[PDB]
From Swiss-Prot, chain A:
The gene is SEM1. It comes from Homo sapiens. One of its GO terms (cellular component) is proteasome complex. The lineage of its organism: Eukaryota, Metazoa, Chordata, Craniata, Vertebrata. The chain holds residues 17 to 65 of 70 of the full protein. Expressed in limb bud, craniofacial primordia and skin. This is 26S proteasome complex subunit SEM1. The keyword Nucleus applies. The keyword Nucleus applies. Belongs to the DSS1/SEM1 family.
From Swiss-Prot, chain B:
Belongs to the AAA ATPase family. It is found in: Cytoplasm; Nucleus. The chain holds residues 21 to 58 of 406 of the full protein. Component of the 26S proteasome, a multiprotein complex involved in the ATP-dependent degradation of ubiquitinated proteins. This complex plays a key role in the maintenance of protein homeostasis by removing misfolded or damaged proteins, which could impair cellular functions, and by removing proteins whose functions are no longer required. Therefore, the proteasome participates in numerous cellular processes, including cell cycle progression, apoptosis, or DNA damage repair. Component of the 19S proteasome regulatory particle complex. The 26S proteasome consists of a 20S core particle (CP) and two 19S regulatory subunits (RP). The regulatory particle is made of a lid composed of 9 subunits, a base containing 6 ATPases including PSMC5 and few additional components. Component of a complex with USP49 and RUVBL1. Interacts with PRPF19. Interacts with TRIM5. Interacts with NDC80. Interacts with PAAF1. Interacts, in vitro, with the thyroid hormone receptor (in a thyroid hormone T3-dependent manner) and with retinoid X receptor (RXR). Interacts with ERCC6. This is 26S proteasome regulatory subunit 8. It comes from the Eukaryota. It comes from Homo sapiens.
UniProtKB/Swiss-Prot annotation, chain D:
PANTHER family: 26S PROTEASOME NON-ATPASE REGULATORY SUBUNIT 6, 26S PROTESOME SUBUNIT 6. The keyword Iron-sulfur does not apply. Keywords: Proteasome. Component of the 26S proteasome, a multiprotein complex involved in the ATP-dependent degradation of ubiquitinated proteins. This complex plays a key role in the maintenance of protein homeostasis by removing misfolded or damaged proteins, which could impair cellular functions, and by removing proteins whose functions are no longer required. Therefore, the proteasome participates in numerous cellular processes, including cell cycle progression, apoptosis, or DNA damage repair. Component of the 19S proteasome regulatory particle complex. The 26S proteasome consists of a 20S core particle (CP) and two 19S regulatory subunits (RP). The regulatory particle is made of a lid composed of 9 subunits including PSMD6, a base containing 6 ATPases and few additional components. PROSITE patterns: PCI. Belongs to the proteasome subunit S10 family. The gene is PSMD6. It holds the Pfam family RPN7_PSMD6_C. This is 26S proteasome non-ATPase regulatory subunit 6.
Swiss-Prot record, chain E:
Keywords: Isopeptide bond, Phosphoprotein, Proteasome, Ubl conjugation. The lineage of its organism: Eukaryota, Metazoa, Chordata, Craniata, Vertebrata. It comes from Homo sapiens (Human). GO terms for cellular component: cytosol; extracellular exosome; extracellular region; ficolin-1-rich granule lumen; membrane; nucleoplasm; nucleus; proteasome accessory complex. Belongs to the proteasome subunit S3 family. Component of the 26S proteasome, a multiprotein complex involved in the ATP-dependent degradation of ubiquitinated proteins. This complex plays a key role in the maintenance of protein homeostasis by removing misfolded or damaged proteins, which could impair cellular functions, and by removing proteins whose functions are no longer required. Therefore, the proteasome participates in numerous cellular processes, including cell cycle progression, apoptosis, or DNA damage repair. The keyword Ubl conjugation applies. The modification Phosphoserine is found at S361, S373. This is 26S proteasome non-ATPase regulatory subunit 3. Component of the 19S proteasome regulatory particle complex. The 26S proteasome consists of a 20S core particle (CP) and two 19S regulatory subunits (RP). The regulatory particle is made of a lid composed of 9 subunits including PSMD3, a base containing 6 ATPases and few additional components. Interacts with UBQLN1 (via ubiquitin-like domain). Interacts with ERCC6. The chain holds residues 58 to 498 of 534 of the full protein.
Length: 41, 38, 70, 380, 441
């Protein structure tokens, strides 16, 4: 019972990727270094 | 004339479904009676 | 009526009962049991009792009147 | 036991060279060039030159090509001699040697087809296992997911028919490495913990590297009781960690709830993990999961805590801890909510009954959707 | 050539298939059960393929053959094979069987085969006449079973007018046929006709008309899961356009759940597109897996970019994806909804803030949502609270937004209501399963 009325119109990774993976940000080491030097002084 | 055709059609479908329900009820009763007799 | 029949089935295995020794199964709902009276009887078995618990030595409780295994 | 061909160190060095900050590195280049010139690896030299836009040395390349050609002629001559004068065992050994040389000199497709032909001609079960392990090593070297999966299935089936414990342990190590490669960290931790006491696959990596991988993956996978029982109290793990103070500190900081040291060690571990050829794409995911794990572990023992307390415990500022907490709650990872007016995080851990009711609702909804679909299918 | 012989072999197995189908139709006629008809039309799509000109020629020369006007109508519309050596006389009807007029089921099924084959040959005008003749023949027939078959051809009729790009010269006819089915109390025909009419309405953008009808007409529950899915998708589109976003999301989720597993790639793709758009309108980030499915990866990739842009809060990225792929949305019929989301992005940020924090002040909300002024933040949070997206209250005396404290739901009546719905569904399922029991005589 196919629905032919509606026409049926690289990154080949197997693991499930969560939305946060797409979010861009600096490395955690950089963030930790920045926070450490901010709170150090 | 379409009176009779429509009426007998609706009556035929309802009597068909009622006969099917009666058959299944007959079978259910037969199973219950077999259990009781056993 | 089915509920009444089940109630009677339960009423069959009612106090008092006579202890015997289940001697040997013969077939479905049929066995030989050695009662404590001192005699062996060829009796029937209620369908309620599982057929796996009837070891050829395990003690069973029988109806006082008909001696049937209950 | 098994030969180190192909060398995974070569793949690690190539990946490190492909990295931006290590693209201009020289020591990696020197070590890789030394490995290639010790192995006379011409086709992989061409592949690396075209991938990295390197300037090919014509003299060295021609010497490598001539050496490969004469060696291949020698193996072909030995194969012909075995076919003419000897039995199937000698021709089999010659074909295995040819395939091994093809894989050694960096040929991918040639090694694949030669090993496939050998497997077609291979009869002895141990030799079939060895050929399948060679194919698995090649797939790991080239990160060929389909090849690795197919060869893993083949090896599992072969071991199920007939499997010695040594080859089964090696297959466990390979499966753990692949599971790490596909971010399936739970299975990787299972396999690495099962194989840590009897690790013999030194061709894949050294014992210390395997143990560091095991510690990382077990930390990201196991809960607190399992981590304490199998990793914190692990005999061999502790023995090797005595020679790895950084990894030991990283592991023990989270278990001992020393969260500032844990965060610093996690930054170090992330820096190590970025350069790793095998843990490459999952370093952000691993770091995020570790941050979530630390936050949840701290919040498990508290009902309501000031944001300053977390800032002091993790050795960070209030703003950073607030931002990370908000991001992780928004993703539904931490059972808490923040009161920024008082700057207090209040945990919202469901009780046993509430969690059981929610799980019942979810599972029953799925089962009832299945039941409705089935009934509508069958009742016409 | 042996290729033509193998073609003849598959043709005669298709002949056996259609013979089995017409036998099932006659068994339904003489067995007082319409389920055999449903099974025949279930096997119908499978045999809609594997056919050619000679298959249908041998079909129409095996059945009918009563010298009726049917032969004069369907034979000229298709080609005929030559004097083949294998002149296997395929005659399912022998003597009295061929003497009696064909039942409406079998003639309707074979004429349906003609129209679908003609459509597969992509000459729509030729199929137009055969469809018109088919529905002139079946209009007068009042057979209950034929309605099932009628239902199917109904759909096919609308289908052909899709390739004729008119869709309007038949709207009144579909209205009248739907009304006739409604007075006949038919289930399948009424449902499929409602679905086709809704599709026509949305193709001509008459959303108010569709909303009026779905408010007036009632979709029969005891219908096909396929027709149910189509109706749910159309209703979800209606409610999404009518701003009833939550009900639209629920209806489209139900439609996706009732999709034919993996049979309709295009319908599933369209449903996923619309569901993603409406869920974004609600402020909920959709499931990531939707974008990584093998069949829906490229189709939803522009929607992946849209979701990433809105979740990141970068309105510049939103405008950029509008510039490049937004035109595709017009082909997908979602551009207006995408503009609504462009102007409703901030709802997602407000929902995120409500989820994470519990007593966040207005100034902090404005800072975290890029809002210029705290008063604008007050307005936005109050509107979001009123519109059923947030569960907070703003203490305007000192300007903090206190979320409604979470109460132990298991101590409330909500679990009882959920269990009541589940129990009612389970009891209804048991009643339906035991109710038929299909014990034959």
């Amino acid at each position: 019972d196919e629905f032919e009325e509606f026409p049926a119109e690289e990154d080949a990774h197997v693991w499930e990727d969560n939305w946060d993976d797409d979010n861009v940000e600096d490395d955690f080491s950089n963030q930790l270094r920045a926070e450490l030097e901010k709170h150090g002084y | 004339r379409q009176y009779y055709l429509s009426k007998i059609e609706e009556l035929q479908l309802i009597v068909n479904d009622k006969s099917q329900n009666l058959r299944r009820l007959q079978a259910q009763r037969n199973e219950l009676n077999a259990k009781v007799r056993l | 009526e089915f509920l009444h029949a089940q109630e009677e089935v339960k009423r069959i295995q009612s106090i008092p009962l006579v202890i015997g020794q289940f001697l040997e199964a013969v077939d479905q709902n049929t066995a030989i049991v050695g009662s404590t009276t001192g005699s062996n009887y060829y009796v029937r078995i209620l369908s309620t009792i599982d057929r796996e618990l009837l070891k050829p030595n395990a003690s069973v409780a029988l109806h006082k009147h008909s001696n049937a295994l209950v | 036991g098994l030969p180190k061909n192909p060398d995974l160190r070569i793949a690690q060095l190539r990946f490190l060279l492909s990295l931006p900050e290590h693209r201009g590195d020289a020591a990696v280049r020197d070590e890789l060039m030394a490995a290639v010139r010790d192995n006379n690896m011409a086709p992989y030299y061409e592949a690396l030159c075209k991938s990295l836009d390197w300037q090919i040395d014509v003299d060295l390349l021609n010497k490598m090509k001539k050496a490969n050609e004469d060696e291949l002629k020698r193996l072909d001559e030995e194969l012909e001699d075995a076919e003419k004068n000897l039995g199937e065992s000698e021709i089999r050994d010659a074909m295995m040697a040819k395939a091994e040389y093809l894989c050694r000199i960096g040929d991918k497709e040639g090694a694949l087809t030669a090993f496939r032909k050998t497997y077609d001609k291979t009869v002895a079960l141990g030799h079939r296992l060895d050929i399948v392990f060679y194919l698995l090593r090649i797939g790991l070297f080239y990160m060929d997911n389909d090849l690795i999966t197919r060869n893993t299935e083949k090896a599992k089936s072969l071991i199920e028919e007939g499997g010695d414990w040594d080859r089964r342990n090696r297959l466990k190590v390979y499966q753990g490495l692949y599971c790490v490669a596909i971010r399936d960290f739970k299975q990787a931790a299972e396999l690495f913990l099962d194989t840590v006491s009897t690790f013999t696959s030194y061709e894949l990596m050294d014992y210390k590297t395997f143990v560091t991988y095991t510690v990382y993956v077990s930390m990201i996978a196991l809960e607190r009781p399992d981590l304490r029982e199998k990793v914190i109290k692990g005999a061999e793990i502790l023995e090797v960690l005595h020679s790895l103070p950084a990894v030991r500190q990283y592991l023990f900081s989270l278990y001992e709830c020393r969260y500032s040291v844990f965060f610093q060690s996690l930054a170090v571990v992330e820096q190590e993990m970025k350069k790793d050829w095998l843990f490459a794409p999952h370093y952000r995911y691993y770091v995020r999961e570790m941050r979530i794990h630390a936050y949840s572990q701290l919040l498990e023992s508290y009902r309501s805590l000031t944001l300053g307390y977390m800032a002091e415990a993790f050795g960070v500022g209030v703003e950073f801890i607030d931002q990370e907490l908000s991001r992780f709650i928004a993703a539904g990872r931490l059972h808490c909510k923040i009161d920024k007016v008082n700057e207090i995080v209040e945990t919202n851990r469901p009780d046993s009954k509430n969690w059981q009711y929610q799980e019942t609702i979810k599972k029953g909804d799925l089962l009832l959707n299945r039941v409705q679909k089935l009934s509508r299918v069958i009742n016409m | 050539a042996a290729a033509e012989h193998s073609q003849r072999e598959l043709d005669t197995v298709t002949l056996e298939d259609i013979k089995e189908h017409v036998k099932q139709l006659e068994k339904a006629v003489s067995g007082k059960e319409p389920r055999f008809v449903l099974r025949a039309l279930r096997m119908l799509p499978s045999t809609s393929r594997r056919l050619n000109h000679y298959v249908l020629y041998k079909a129409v020369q095996g059945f009918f053959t009563s010298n009726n006007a049917t032969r004069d109508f369907l034979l000229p519309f298709l080609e005929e094979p030559m004097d083949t050596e294998a002149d296997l006389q395929f005659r399912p009807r022998t003597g009295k069987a061929a003497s009696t007029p064909l039942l409406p089921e079998v003639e309707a099924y074979l004429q349906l085969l003609v129209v679908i084959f003609m459509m597969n040959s992509k000459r729509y005008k030729e199929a137009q006449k055969i469809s018109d003749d088919l529905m002139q023949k079946i209009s007068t027939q009042n057979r209950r079973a034929l309605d099932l078959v009628a239902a199917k051809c109904y759909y096919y009729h609308a289908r052909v007018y899709e390739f004729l790009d008119k869709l309007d010269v038949v709207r009144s006819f579909l209205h009248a046929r739907l009304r006739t089915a409604t007075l006949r109390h038919d289930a399948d025909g009424q449902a499929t006709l409602l679905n086709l009419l809704l599709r026509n309405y949305l193709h001509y953008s008459l959303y108010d008309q569709a909303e009026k009808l779905v408010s007036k007409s009632v979709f029969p529950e005891q219908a096909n899961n396929n027709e149910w899915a189509r109706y749910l998708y159309y209703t979800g589109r209606i409610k999404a356009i009518q701003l009833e976003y939550s009900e639209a999301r629920r209806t489209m989720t139900n439609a996706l759940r009732k999709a034919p597993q993996h049979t309709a790639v295009g319908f599933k793709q369209t449903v996923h597109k619309l569901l993603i758009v409406v869920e974004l309108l609600l402020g909920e980030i959709p499931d990531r897996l939707q974008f990584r499915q093998p069949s829906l990866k490229r189709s939803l990739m522009p929607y992946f970019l849209l979701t990433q842009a809105v979740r990141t809060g970068n309105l510049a990225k939103f405008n950029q994806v509008l510039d490049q792929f937004g035109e595709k949305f017009q082909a997908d019929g979602t551009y207006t909804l995408i503009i609504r989301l462009r102007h409703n992005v901030i709802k997602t940020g407000v929902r995120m803030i409500s989820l994470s924090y519990s007593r966040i002040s207005l100034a902090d909300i404005a800072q975290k949502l890029q809002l210029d002024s705290p008063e604008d933040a007050e307005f936005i949070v109050a509107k979001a609270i009123r519109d059923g997206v947030i569960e907070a209250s703003i203490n305007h005396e000192k300007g903090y937004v206190q979320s409604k404290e979470m109460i132990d739901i298991y101590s409330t009546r909500e679990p009882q209501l959920a269990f009541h719905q589940r129990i009612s569904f389970c009891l209804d399922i048991h009643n339906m399963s035991v109710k038929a029991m299909r014990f034959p005589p």
